[PDB]
Design a protein around this ligand. Sequence first.
Ligand SMILES: [Mg+2]
Ligand SMILES: [Zn+2]
Ligand SMILES: [Zn+2]
Ligand SMILES: [Zn+2]
Lengths: 180, 160, 773, 65, 114, 196, 43, 264, 133, 86
Amino acid sequence: FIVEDDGHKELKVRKGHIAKLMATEYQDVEEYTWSSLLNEGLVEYIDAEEEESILIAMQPEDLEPAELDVDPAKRIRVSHHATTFTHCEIHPSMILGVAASIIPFPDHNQSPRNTYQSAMGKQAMGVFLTNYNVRMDTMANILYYPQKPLGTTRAMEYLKFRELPAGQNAIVAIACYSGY
Amino acid sequence: YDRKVPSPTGEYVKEPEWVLETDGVNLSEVMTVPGIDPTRIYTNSFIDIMEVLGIEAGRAALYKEVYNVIASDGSYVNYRHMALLVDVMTTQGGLTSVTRHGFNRSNTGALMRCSFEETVEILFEAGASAELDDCRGVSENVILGQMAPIGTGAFDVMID
Amino acid sequence: RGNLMGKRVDFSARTVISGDPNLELDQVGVPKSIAKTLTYPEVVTPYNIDRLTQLVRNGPNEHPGAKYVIRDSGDRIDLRYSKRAGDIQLQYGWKVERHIMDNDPVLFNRQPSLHKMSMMAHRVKVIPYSTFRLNLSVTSPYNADFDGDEMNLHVPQSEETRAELSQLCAVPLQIVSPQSNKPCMGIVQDTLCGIRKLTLRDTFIELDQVLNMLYWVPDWDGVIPTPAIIKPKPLWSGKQILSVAIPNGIHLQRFDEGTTLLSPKDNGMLIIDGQIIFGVVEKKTVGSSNGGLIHVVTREKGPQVCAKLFGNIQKVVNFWLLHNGFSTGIGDTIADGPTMREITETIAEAKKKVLDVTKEAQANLLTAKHGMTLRESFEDNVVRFLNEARDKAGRLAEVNLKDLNNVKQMVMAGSKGSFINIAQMSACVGQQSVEGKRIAFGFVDRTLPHFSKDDYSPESKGFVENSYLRGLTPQEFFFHAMGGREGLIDTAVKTAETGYIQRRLVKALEDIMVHYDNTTRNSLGNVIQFIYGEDGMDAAHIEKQSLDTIGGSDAAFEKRYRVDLLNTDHTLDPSLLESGSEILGDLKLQVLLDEEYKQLVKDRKFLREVFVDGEANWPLPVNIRRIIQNAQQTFHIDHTKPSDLTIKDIVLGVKDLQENLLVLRGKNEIIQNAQRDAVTLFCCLLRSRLATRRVLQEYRLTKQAFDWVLSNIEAQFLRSVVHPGEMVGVLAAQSIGEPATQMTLKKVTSGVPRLKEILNVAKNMKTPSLTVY
Amino acid sequence: MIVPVRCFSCGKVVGDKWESYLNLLQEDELDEGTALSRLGLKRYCCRRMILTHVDLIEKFLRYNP
Amino acid sequence: MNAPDRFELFLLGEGESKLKIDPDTKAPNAVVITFEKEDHTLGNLIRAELLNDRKVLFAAYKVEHPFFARFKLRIQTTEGYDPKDALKNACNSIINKLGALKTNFETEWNLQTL
Amino acid sequence: ASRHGQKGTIGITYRREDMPFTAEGIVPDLIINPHAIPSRMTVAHLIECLLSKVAALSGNEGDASPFTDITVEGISKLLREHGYQSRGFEVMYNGHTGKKLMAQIFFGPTYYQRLRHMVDDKIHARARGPMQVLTRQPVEGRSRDGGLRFGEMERDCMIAHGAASFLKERLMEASDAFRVHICGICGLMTVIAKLN
Amino acid sequence: TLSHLRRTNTPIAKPRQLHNTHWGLVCPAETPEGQACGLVKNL
Amino acid sequence: SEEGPQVKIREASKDNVDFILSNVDLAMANSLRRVMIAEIPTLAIDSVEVETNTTVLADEFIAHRLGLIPLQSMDIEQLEYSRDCFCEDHCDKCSVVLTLQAFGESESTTNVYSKDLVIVSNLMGRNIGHPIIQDKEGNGVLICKLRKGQELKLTCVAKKGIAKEHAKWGPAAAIEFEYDPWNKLKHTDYWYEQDSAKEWPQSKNCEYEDPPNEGDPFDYKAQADTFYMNVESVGSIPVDQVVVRGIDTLQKKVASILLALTQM
Amino acid sequence: SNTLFDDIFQVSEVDPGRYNKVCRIEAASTTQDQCKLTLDINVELFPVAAQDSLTVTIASSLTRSWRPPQAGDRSLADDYDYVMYGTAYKFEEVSKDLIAVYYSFGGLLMRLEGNYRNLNNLKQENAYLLIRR
Amino acid sequence: LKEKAIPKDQRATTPYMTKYERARILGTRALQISMNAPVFVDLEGETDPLRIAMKELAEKKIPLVIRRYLPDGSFEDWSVEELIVD
RNA sequence: AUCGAGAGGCU
Ligand SMILES: [Mg+2]
Ligand SMILES: [Zn+2]
Ligand SMILES: [Zn+2]
Ligand SMILES: [Zn+2]
């Protein structure tokens, strides 16, 4: 994202542009595309060396002005304690990889477990393609009745996971039983 | 260091004592300092201790270092095993390293040595010096496939 | 290294492993296909020719059968494709490649083979499905786990090989690990939590369940034990039932904290003659610990008794557990409200304290304590504060965890898990670390771009306040990933470095064999240790017993050991001996008492001049307390009547005993000197426990009971001698290399870095430190 | 790749309920929960079979031969 | 591949006697009965019925290994009480209970509408 | 495996009768050991079980996106709204007996993955199979009916037991045994041998 | 398939660790195990 | 009426029956719930000989899917196990032959519902082999889908079996099972955080059994004898016959014990 | 084969501890200010109130297998409300003419002090405890 | 070398049969019994040559002699009879 | 026969 003064400091994109985007997306009329944003000067490409000179926000809510009785269940986030903002990341979940974006609630797990699972999800059987009957590969495995997961990341929508799953919502019981 | 010492009454009690810890080792000189005890001083550079306090003191320093590295993880291995290792390294003149530079240069035949590191170079030096291999070594008979002189073949069996 | 030292062999097999509680220990569940494929050559004899004919008739394709036949002519016979597979005329002396049958010995192993206890003999049990099967209590020596692990099996082809498997590599023999002088095997996670729940004072089993339980133990007499409760409803306790698996004549004593003989919280453990008296059973009692049940039953009754005991425990415990249930859920990770409030209170307190320390630092008021900079001292202060806060919040959690909380129970029994696990999962997960330091400054003067420059605040360098349950924030998640990668890399390196170290040790000490004279020699005969282990004992048959001589006041020393025939107050009250009246004066006896006492004092100041620390618990080749309790239960002492032992008997029998606890048998001065130097410590322990007062005021022995004690100690010593031919070198190499494999991660080079520094002589060591007294 | 016949857990048939579902959702503009509860899919052992199923076969048809 | 044919849970084969009976050692008036090709369904019911006959001292079953369909039933009775007789009494009481239950349920369902 | 590095092999296949069951007759497709939980701190496994229950009942999607305001307390509230115990626990009876398990059990939907590692393609056996031409040793790999390597590392662990003749057998009759003739003057196998 | 299309090799214990600069560009967790861990990454 | 077990039905329907068992030992109710799943024999497909398969689905996929099709099994006990009859492979009084043939005629998608199964063998006048249809529209389960141009033609053979050998031969729809909503037996200890009561929900069966007094001590010698069940059925056999046939199978199982006992 | 001790105790201190069905009871002999006892007792079977007065008795009998009561033909030696079976594991000679006996009823322990039962209690596997109302 | 035996009286080695020589002894006797060799005990209804050799050892009727070599080249001969098993 | 890559396993 891109932030600049207004008024006070604020990022550039607004709900008007979001509505234009969802309008171009729903059409499935001047379309609104990513290239429009990049050319309109609302979103920028920051490489490694460049971000050494910027101070990024984590949530757009960080640009909200604030001057208690909070649901104690929610995790603790440090108060921003910074004003000289330049950008806001699109969404933190985007830092993850492809295979790790599959993991549900990875913000809750010892990271070695996430690493193990991101290595194994490349070994899980599933529908690797839809033309699997037509393609003649050396070795291929396909689940009889794949199921989309009940617990879904957002990024799955873009990874086409709910359309080409590789597991099943098995009813699992955590119990001692016969020691087997 | 809150060591324990005999009370004049006889039972052990903890009597705390100050101890210095350095980041350098020149023992041959720090040993001869006044105001210290030249009998208990310890240096984790057991090599300098071999050089100064004789080899057999280096034995105990080496074992103490191994014991500390084991007990770091709450572990324990019986004394005899570390003692075997330490004394094998020690039983020669001085410290024989556990590497090609050390025991592999000993006179323990050729094939027993050939099967660790620098195989062909060992074979060449042996074919030069006309090494007469004892062939009582384990790896020698294992290579030969014959029954190696081990606990089950460490003897012969015959008739009445 | 690929075709002579180790190569590929026939009669081998490999597949997945899976645990089956209903298999005995020494058993291996072999799939039926592998058994159909592997062959053992058996020679035809009049005792077997019938079984062999039938086997031939079952064919190589259906088990139990045979595959090949070898006549005297040396030309083979294939049973799959032959005119005469059915009509055979078995001639004597011929060989038959029978299938692998039940109760066969097979060499079963796991790679990596670090241990002698990783390649063990196993009795075959053929099962239908496609996996190798083995007992749970045999994971520890193999370091096995059923998440896809694989294991290997080899089959002998001659009877002497089968003998070497049955009598040396048998699984029960490898129970007491030589290294660590402890049993490597023990009760496992599920069975462990189950046995804890079962042995509670609050556990009551009713007649219906009780009868099935009693039946489950295979070698049961078939005599019900009288229940605890009778009148309102016949009820048994988990201890009462479980004591059936415990063989008669076993006595076990253990005192934890607050283990009054009343046992208010049922801590510790006391068990008498195959009956458990009191104590909640858990890891320390039944795990692979020294002084545990397995050590006792192995030393006392033997290998096979303890082997069967394993299954006899597991079966009852698995039955009860299966009919009682267990789960985890998240509710066993939720701390209630006020605990969360006080935990975030502790966190905010630590935050404000670190902020105040930093404000102090910003005014150049820090004390540059000698030997370290301002920044190093500051970092140490902050890391100390953050670990303080994490551990304090974790104890704040563990306090509030109720008893029914299944994580608290799994931890209490010692099944799996620990404190830090609870602290992180519930309270707060603490401070991540990279190369010892906190989160470094990857970017210019900041950790992450969402931070201002030069921000040393806790979260700015990775203090993960939130608990795993509460949810990790993005930056904290990233720092945690940074730490996890360091961990995985340290694993992937230490593994290879440890494999190299072990290979070098094995190749170094491969020829170190205790010869017959006990001179620990090499191939070249160069002596290494004139007495293996400096005492001539095998590493097993050695237990952690105390020396009552060392420590304790001289006053209490006298009060318990001084027996003076020439004083009305320092002499054996005739309530302690028959001849006690006619024993006063008698200089011919006080001379022997003063000899004994001078020897005991000489030995007290001897050991006290060796063990400057004064620690009394040490490994010794024969346990005494077990023999004393075996006496107190075998002969049923009344502790009221006096003994029938003249002091001459006691002291002359002890002084003659040391003459027969032989280690070496030379008839010359040097060998007998080495002998006196080999039994010295044991004889010290002996004279401590066979004190003429102790045998009569603490023990209350009879004559025959004492002679039984002497014969038993002599026998147990002579058994505990290290057996010649032991390649103790390879054993020691493995015994040091294996614990290095598990050397996981204050200011010194330690762990595998230090080990590499040590073995390879590292003149340029990283941390050369001098300690000055 | 198609609707399983019955729930693997219990065994109540579900195959005869697919086309109803797709209709109960679109023709009648219902939500998922009311639809599942309508077809006598009370327990979730069955409910997951219909809610989480993916009908790939409609993509498998497009391939011509 | 190595799996047993599924019918091997209830199809006895090659002289697989339904019931084997053996005297228990170190236990007078007691017997162990190997039930072949059976499961907990029958054994637990037999034991629960045996426990209600007063003249039966001990009655318990064990399923040795879940791979196999079989179990063992051990019974100790009073003096002058052959255990097979207690077994017969138990099974007969079971069958009479079952017939009574079937009759009651048929009556109630025929009374029941919808 | 689940989606949290919970690897696991099948040790047993139970039938629905022998399986425990809730009052609703629902039977666990899978039974996993509780002990494997706390040593890995895979809390998300249990949270996913809970959330998948809530979704399967409510008929919504499980929003497991990271960095969300999904409170376990709110998941519990939703689950209690639908008549189940708010932490995923369920009263369960043993199948063999029907006696209620005195300890209640954690139970619910959970996404699971079947992995490319399968046994019937890993089982291996050999008893005097093919021989490699170069070293007259058993060839490598089960795909060619090969033999297992009795590596030197294993030979060490074997010698620690002191089995001399077992080692001789594993190294002579189990692979590339050979009888060769040698001359008593030149101790080399250059001897012309006409055995027949 | 995707994780194989977004692979990154490195031809070279300093590098393998996660560097701060990998934020937003490379996955924190997704990487092989054992040998060559942390060298081969995923965008 | 009859002395012993007592039964009241709370509710009954074509596919499920919720009822109450009184004055019965538990182990009997357990063995009944087990038999009602496992050993009550019904009929479903055990062979499929495929003729032509142009579908996008593998052949053995379709064979599996046919296995699970529910076939009417009311008059089954007048049929015999194929392992028991003396035919070559399957007679007409040990098995029922079915056939299926559909073609991708329509440009629009051509489904294959279960109702398109055609019988061949002689029924000999017993209500057997009708693929059950519980759908509103009369179309059975969905077996496969067909594009214009694809055809499918195969021959099923259904034999008699039990859920043990394979779970397609079960009326095994979920069997609701409960007793003692109040835990008066002290059979289970309720996991709780603050209070054991307000955290767990009360069962509906709480309406029928009186709550315990706070002052009431434990009735130790109380044994559970009152159970609450709800049997569901797929449709292979109506619910009324499911429980009755299970009971009869159980009595016959004990009869086999009696007969082998007398044979001894 | 008869009784070995008899007394009456007034309840001094009852404690639930962490156990849910068992309580640690402690009392002292009535009208005798020198003999007391500790005991573990199931409260679910036999409730125990504070400051009660409970008859306490110990018998030797009234080996071979157990058997449940076939009928009333088996003559009980117990009109009491509570019965247990124990084992002697310690006889603490506390003071001069003062002894303490330690029993364990399958885990539920018992401690007894005093020196007027001396001629009776023994290191005997067999030990029965009876408690009337 | 030349007749470097050891007189039976002047013997210092362990009279106890070490488990290693015991295993080798049972192996060689089970080899004898493997082929058709004589048996010197009333085989009380057992067939496994290993259990037969173990019983043969208990009754000490196994006529074999250990030759315990000593490192210099000396060696002590020990018949089974004078060797103890424990 | 060579070489390369990917994967399995070790709280
Ligand atoms: Mg593994
Ligand atoms: Zn279902
Ligand atoms: Zn020559
Ligand atoms: Zn027929």
